[PDB]
């Protein structure tokens, strides 16, 4: 927080929203007991109607008690309009029956938002890919010219990566979509198992099949690792935008608005600042992942060490990821692409990108692979170091030119060959209407 | 590495096994082209029958080549039994068509073993849980006596955690059960799409729907995070054994063998050494997860930074987890339980563990929660301070004994009350009736 | 933030405080140029007198510019009371000349606070150690009874660890106590090297000997690793308090106030909640450390990826550490110690802690080590499993009792022997006035 | 591990070297007791002269003992040449008196080697910086052209970073240059304080002022964080080489050997493979740092969880860093620089890099900053859009050419201006005049 927090996600993590969730858990729990016949219907009707809290009082009481949940229930007890029935608030419950169930309910909400952000990002990627299906450009391996590809295929790669991440996310969201109301040490000793079933059902959560004082933190570790993975996928794509905007390359550029200023001292600057910002946040979220894993080995039926960490990392990770998904989705959507610079750059390594095809054709004419490679390599290295065209050199090279005709040589130097399966890949990905 | 490495897993990571995997990918790729009609059946028959490699020669050639895949294919071409058909080896393939596809193949073998280990460990936890289903002991929260539970429910919690981990593992194993043979930058420009399909199917791998020169490393990051999560679950259980074996409590002890010595200087020692060992290895694996995440943001259609890192972390994590699952499963299996110590320990906090039951019964009789709590708390704190039994203090307060019969007071102090849902939990878990 | 933020540290990280630091950098820079004679003294006098900013305007301008520093300088330009001299604000500067120098100045302030917190914690430790110099208790290795030590020596260990950390901290504080004003790419091309010397001197910073657009992030990585180390030392000590407060053990207890409530459902509870909270925060700060290291490989003369991460981790780490040092120092200071429970616990393993001394005395009487160990071990293991006193068993054991007299046996069972060097250790540490 | 392991460092981590270190600690401890008068000189003379061990026998004994130090001392006692004086081996010592003291001894050997490597690498960077002190090239911020710098200043920045790392390393090496021989729980109860002093001094170690059964792991965490910081500095430099070798820019290339092959399929490739390799190993080492931090919170007077972890990370980190320092130093030494490409590239952004110089000169002539900036920005953006030279656009604006003479305009577009303080920086760094 706070320039990295959008309003939708910030709102779910307020104290107000937390205490509201606690109150709802408590009231549902009394309603469950009343269904069982263990406490009177009339008592709980009153609790549902009149039970409330004043946050400032919660905090005042907490100054004495040094205990959140006790402060909360004692504050609820002082609601103008509750009478004796206040008796039943927290009946049979332990602290984390409320805290963990409420926390899972809040995460359920966060995860609905994140799922929607992720689906929207996938659509943006799909739309960009279709736009640049045949936008030809150099493929680069080790940062060096390899062979041609298209910007659409690059975006199609990202699209498919994010679909993998949507699936992973659903599984992670599910592992934390659970509540527990099993009492002090998870035994149900003081609280009928039906109470948990009812409360969880009414919050859209599953009931933990077995619990201690708390939910088990393997769930939250799985969850954070998935958040960190999504962020790290986004960093991968941001790193790519940054590389393509480099001045020698300029195949792409982040949208630059009227009135924008790129730097304080250099009026000419247009920078990939959005993508750089995403890179930073991905690092923070990976740190949260390490924290989450360290929260797993809790002692016995619990220690509370995870809570102080989760107070930080759960709001911060979800807030940051929501911000990243929305901001970077807009960066991609509004991204300027320069097909002319892409084609020009394919020119800049003297046609050396055709070296494999010359080699493979030599093999077709019955040369052994290492013999073909070793004829072609010195020619390629000569072009590098004397900066003369590679086709010239193979044409002026008589042991190739004895095995390949001129029209065979020319076919080796045609980039169109490399576009032959773009449509078939897109068809697989679902990116056509063929 | 090597006191922590079992032969079953060590065998799948030898160099010889890698290069055997590489050879098979090459031969299958040739066989695919022959089915396409693009290379003579005659030629591939000879390749399948005779292609081989000498491993010392691979290393010799790499000294000059500074390139392992080239060293490999050149070594294959030196196979005396191969004639000119050697021309076809690696035809249309890029380095990593072999390396990544073979790596996934080796990982599939590793994962078959780890799934087996996970399933053996789940079974060990089930047997132990059933054995100790009614072994009464203190539940502890914040390390301090809370209310009774059973050792079986503690073991059942580990069982269900490992079931969650098995499902996580199946997802993770699947995300890396993929191959690619799409040529230099993933375009199929030099290699018919059918070759990939043929090769992957023959190795039991899915074909990446879209690739570059490499598989995308979000997969390997998901995978490593799941290995680390399993390790961290094992740490949690290991820390519990270490806690329960502490001298003041001694509710459990690791099996101590005839001829074993616990320390160099103190003949009386018996230590939770196995558990301590698991804790250290979990730390190591969590480090490997961070490494894997940092491997995701590769440049463009790939950089090779992930390779050096994967050579360390992929064998080391799989070897270490296989060792941990086996060693810790044995620790649990052979673990010594002291139910008499467990019962003794429930006695040591003066019956204070029944404080909740007295408070709740007081609410049943009409007291508001804060009134009940604040009657009971001082008596509780008095017992801590004074070494007198909580029950006696409860029986001396007229405003309690006016509302509770002796029967009812006596019910509060019965631990059998706390075992009332052990069976209902076990039934959910599937742990009932054999 | 925010229940984990004390007012001293929160105040330095406000936007207001940041923009004030930016303004001071800018004014100092104009004052330097005027010393050089490059801009008129009268112009800069006016800038020193009248230059200011309105934060709401900074933010409004930033909406257009999408650029912090430009928004700031343009806002400064609109100060009622600056005239033409506004010309010279940011003259020769690049953005991060201001941002990095101002950030280092803010960190200097944070680090003055942290140093004082650390010194205060060291004093608290020293005072507690002197208090319990001869407070005898069991030493435990692998969680199991080893030999006696004293609680003073335990605290003396912590004291010495924190002195190591004060030294590490000074070095870390120093590595980040540097500014740069070297212009767009660190060349001084547009800004005389004297400007940097003057500004840094006037902010209590060193001038970076060589810089790019930014300070190098190895410094901030070193810095965060030290913050994380201090937090992790505190976790080590918190883990110890938690272990010693366990109900079977109760050698120590966190202070519990009149009116405090230990749990919501269990009135008897007194928990080590402070120590548990410290454990959680140490995990968060270690995550920040991983983030900081990932900030090091910046591209060329900089990318801005570090900034979005540092906006989070630098305030959060320093705020959290300041909170930890103050809170945990008060936990130790106010900690209840139970010397009677410590002495009682030394009793609970049947005198087995004397096994080494029986062994060593056997060796003195001319037994080979393995012969002495192997006579003593079964006796020790018999006492464990039949729960009878170890001294009885050695006394009733005729191959010891033939080599050692009764008064030699009795000397082996004297704990006073183990206190003989407490004073000599304390003398070394500086914890005496001998 | 093993293509990444040099003999110099591999040799210090063999088992034989460990056990030799263990033997020497034992013999020195006996020699100390003899100087005290507590064991006969006669006896220790024989121990020093004859004590040995068979390594296969250590492992045999450990199979039964499940304890390596006991297996070691029992193996020493089987030395045929030793008589009853074998009685004294390990007298008063605890397991870790040997293991930790010997570990620090081995680490001291490792660190002598790493300091040597660090110093060799600093020298390589100095030579390269001096060679290229005036090799003009673009400075790049956010990956985009900013202003000119020199390759020598870039190398000088690495030089000074490594000097910071050398000082960090000396501090870290020192924090682990410590031994302990204080008995079971650090009390000297069984072992005269003089033994420790004697042993440490003879091994070139400091004696821990206070210890437990082990040295405190804050030391090893400091140490590992410094190893990771060096690795991460190397990554940063490696990423720069990889950036500059990209095909569009080609300002640098790793040395490419006769007979080397860059790829299996593309004979034209020359890749920054060394640099890519360093990047991967830095990731691994950062993982080991996290592990080391998790080893700090050991229980009470120790648990052994750190041991299994240290067996992996201490050899692996030191071996990997020694490999990285040597390999990357060679990469830099042998690196190919293309100053003609560097000059060519400065041309590719239409002279826009001189935008700041025109703006500042306009301020010199009386324009307010926002006025100067906003005159210059549109011309800059016009040049980007239109492929016309910035200088020509500047010369067509009357409100510029009315204030600047042709001389002055021509000065703005001179890169020599930007080399004016290269020497002043080099002098600070100590890089001048040989």
TrEMBL record, chains A, B, C, D:
Gene Ontology BP term (one): 'de novo' IMP biosynthetic process
SUPFAM superfamilies for this protein: L-aspartase-like
Pathway: Purine metabolism; IMP biosynthesis via de novo pathway; 5-amino-1-(5-phospho-D-ribosyl)imidazole-4-carboxamide from 5-amino-1-(5-phospho-D-ribosyl)imidazole-4-carboxylate: step 2/2; Purine metabolism; AMP biosynthesis via de novo pathway; AMP from IMP: step 2/2
Pfam families: ADSL_C, Lyase_1
Keywords: Cytoplasm, Lyase, Purine biosynthesis
Catalyzed reactions per annotation: (2S)-2-[5-amino-1-(5-phospho-beta-D-ribosyl)imidazole-4-carboxamido]succinate = 5-amino-1-(5-phospho-beta-D-ribosyl)imidazole-4-carboxamide + fumarate; N(6)-(1,2-dicarboxyethyl)-AMP = fumarate + AMP
Adenylosuccinate lyase C-terminal domain span: 350-430
Enzyme class: lyase
Documented EC number(s): 4.3.2.2
One cellular component term from this protein's GO annotations in UniProt: cytosol
Xref: SMART domains: ADSL_C
InterPro entries for this protein: AdenyloSucc_lyase_C, Fumarase/histidase_N, Fumarate_lyase_CS, Fumarate_lyase_fam, Fumarate_lyase_N, L-Aspartase-like, Pur_lyase
A molecular-function term among this protein's GO annotations: N6-(1,2-dicarboxyethyl)AMP AMP-lyase (fumarate-forming) activity
Family under the similarity heading: Belongs to the lyase 1 family. Adenylosuccinate lyase subfamily.
Name the UniProt record assigns to this protein: Adenylosuccinate lyase
Organism listed in the record: Bacillus anthracis (anthrax bacterium)
Recorded name of the encoding gene: purB
